[PDB]
Design a binder for this molecule. Structure first.
Ligand SMILES: CC(C)C[C@H](NC(=O)[C@@H](O)[C@H](N)Cc1ccccc1)C(=O)O
Ligand SMILES: Oc1ccc(CCc2cc(O)cc(O)c2)cc1
Ligand SMILES: [Yb+3]
Ligand SMILES: [Yb+3]
Ligand SMILES: [Yb+3]
Ligand SMILES: [Zn+2]
Length: 607
């Protein structure tokens, strides 16, 4: 059972297709239109069914050309309001009908961010973008909002004619809107069955530049050139991903670089991955995020977690493939470096949560828990650690990539649980079952805390980071003189980032050490967002008042939650900046992304 959804489950009925016809009204900040669901009964004598909704206004529900009775249940917090529809004729098993629902969204849709012209690059036009994962699609349209159900879709979207609509689907043409010549209608087709969390829409002043045989980059005009360069390795990553996962089935792989308030580094919307402009480091150094979202084209979008309790299946396998792509491009030592960094992030998460916390388990129970609140690095890095351990247990990366490809083939177009995975693992490695029975399954899958076994990691690229961080940590006042810009001479941006991650784990350091570090390394000049993030964190946690405006500026001028949440939390923890931190949140709150606003508020214990 999907405890995050109020809709009829897949055992009762299944949505096969959605046809969406809607109009984007920037004046009212509403999407208005009709969602036509092709629904297949899985039961004999089926007479009603229930859909998820959230802050939607339902005008009517039409079946066989007649309006039918429906009822909106009481709101259940972040789950929204269940919508029961009374079918006019009882359905037999496997019978399909079409239900057309006329609806309109709320300007406060938690799926959507509506941006004024000032919040964009061009300053002339507004902009809208969606973010449905995990359970926000119900805030756009009535659906069975669960990844246990996969459906194809088509859509016709009317927007002001000077703007462009894109969706997680193949572009199917554009025309003037017959009902309003100030508007265009953009059409879309997604022929591959997907979970509804993968439905996505952007509307804005978008331009495109081709960067590979199946990839355009889309953004506002002022970011197109830089994005084309930043993401030029995209085709080479697709090719390696295909080698590891099997055929890329989705047609196009385009990229959309969103405005800075986009709450995530990336989102694997099929045919059109969304990314944060905070990837635009200028040197392609943050391109692992592209490798990662590309990997979802197999692990997540093709093989999908059946409920959100099993999210690690999505994320852990994806981080596993991500790291192989980057290992192919840059070497096995680099794969190990990033693998070990991830174990470090898992250390941080488990320390933050506490080693007995329920959300340090690999498989969790999200009953009564808002997924946006439970979200962390655990499913990512504890999932990846399990896979990496198993790789090492079962004979190495070549052997384990064999399993990964077979696993993708086996479960393509399906939604599965941890036991499905484990079951196939045992079937695939049936000649190594005695070895598999040596794994402590209950601990890995179901216990809180760090995993029972740490994998083995090559240290080559990590050693210099640890060495420098330990120099700083053990330095006394009289040792500060020995530090110099030449310390960084042979470190890549990745190593500079890991140096800062190591040092941040021991924060605070003495204020004089941090001032010296700015003195000799000039980290204030680094605009790499990962590096700047950790640096400002280290500065604020070490109580350097100079870094306060820098941390505030970064927290507000972009809204990637990975950066914005810990910066606000750090600033609220520092007595000198606490009052400014809450005031600044209060001031920005109305124009923030709705999920980010909610989480930062809880973080800060404000409103
Ligand atoms: C390299 C990755 C770890 C980057 C990471 N992005 C992802 O994991 C995306 O694939 C996720 N789909 C982001 C996400 C997860 C849950 C709910 C909403 C959005 C991110 O930081 O955004
Ligand atoms: O969008 C989503 C989807 C799933 C979740 C739940 C993710 C999770 C899994 C886990 O094993 C441990 C966690 O601490 C958190 C959170 C957000
Ligand atoms: Yb066509
Ligand atoms: Yb079995
Ligand atoms: Yb000394
Ligand atoms: Zn992911």
């Amino acid at each position: 059972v999907d405890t995050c959804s109020l809709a009829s489950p897949a055992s009762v009925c299944r949505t096969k297709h959605l046809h969406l016809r809607c109009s984007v009204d920037f004046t009212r900040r509403t999407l208005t239109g009709t969602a036509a669901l092709t629904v297949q009964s899985q039961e004999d004598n089926l007479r009603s069914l229930v859909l998820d909704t959230k802050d939607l206004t339902i005008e009517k529900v039409v079946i066989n050309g007649q309006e039918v009775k429906y009822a909106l249940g009481e709101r259940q917090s972040y789950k929204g309001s269940p919508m029961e529809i009374s079918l006019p004729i009882a359905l037999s098993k496997n019978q399909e009908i079409v239900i057309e629902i006329s609806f309109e969204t709320s300007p406060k849709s938690s799926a959507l961010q509506w941006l004024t012209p000032e919040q964009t690059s061009g300053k002339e036009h507004p902009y809208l973008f969606s973010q449905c994962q995990a359970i926000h699609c119900r805030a756009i349209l009535p659906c069975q909002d669960t990844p246990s159900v996969k459906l194809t879709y088509t859509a016709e979207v009317s927007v002001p004619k000077e703007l462009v609509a894109l969706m997680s689907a193949i572009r199917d043409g554009e025309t003037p809107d017959p009902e309003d010549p100030s508007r265009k209608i953009y059409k879309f087709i997604q022929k591959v069955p997907i979970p509804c969390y993968l439905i996505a829409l952007v509307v804005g002043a978008l331009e495109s530049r081709q960067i590979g045989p199946r990839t355009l980059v889309w953004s506002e005009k002022e970011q197109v050139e830089k994005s084309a360069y930043e993401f030029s390795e995209t085709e080479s990553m697709l090719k390696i991903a295909e080698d590891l996962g099997g055929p890329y089935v989705w047609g196009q792989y385009d990229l959309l670089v969103l405005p800075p308030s986009f709450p995530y580094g990336g989102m694997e919307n099929p045919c059109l991955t969304f990314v944060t402009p905070t990837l635009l480091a200028g040197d392609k150094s943050l391109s692992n995020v592209i490798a990662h979202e590309i990997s979802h084209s197999w692990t997540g979008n093709l093989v999908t977690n059946k409920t959100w309790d099993h999210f690690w299946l999505n994320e852990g396998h994806t981080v596993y493939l991500e790291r192989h792509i980057c290992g192919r491009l840059f070497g096995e030592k680099f794969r190990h470096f990033n693998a070990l960094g991830g174990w470090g992030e898992l250390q941080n998460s488990v320390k933050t949560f506490g080693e007995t916390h329920p959300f340090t388990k690999l498989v969790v129970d999200l009953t009564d828990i808002d997924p946006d609140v439970a979200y962390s690095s655990v499913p990512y890095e504890k999932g990846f650690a399990l896979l990496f351990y198993l790789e090492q247990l079962l004979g190495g990366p070549e052997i384990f990539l064999g399993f990964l490809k077979a696993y993708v083939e086996k479960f393509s177009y399906k939604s599965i649980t941890t036991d499905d995975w484990k079951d196939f693992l045992y079937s695939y490695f049936k000649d190594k079952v005695d070895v598999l029975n040596q794994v402590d399954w209950n601990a890995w899958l179901y216990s809180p805390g760090l995993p029972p076994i740490k994998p083995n990691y090559d240290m080559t690229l990590t050693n210099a980071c640890i060495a420098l961080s330990q120099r700083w940590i053990t330095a006394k006042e009289d040792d500060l003189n020995s530090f110099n810009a030449t310390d960084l001479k042979d470190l890549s941006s990745h190593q500079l980032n890991e140096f800062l991650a190591q040092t941040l784990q021991r924060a605070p350091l003495p204020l004089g050490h941090i001032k010296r570090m700015q003195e000799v390394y000039n980290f204030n000049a680094i605009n790499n967002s990962e590096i700047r993030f950790r640096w400002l964190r280290l500065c604020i946690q070490s109580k350097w008042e100079d870094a306060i405006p820098l941390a505030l500026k970064m927290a507000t001028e972009q809204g990637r939650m990975k950066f914005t949440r810990p910066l606000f939390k750090d600033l609220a923890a520092f007595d000198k900046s606490h009052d400014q931190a809450v005031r600044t949140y209060q001031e920005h709150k109305a124009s923030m992304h709705p999920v980010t606003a909610m989480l930062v508020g809880k973080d800060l214990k404000v409103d």
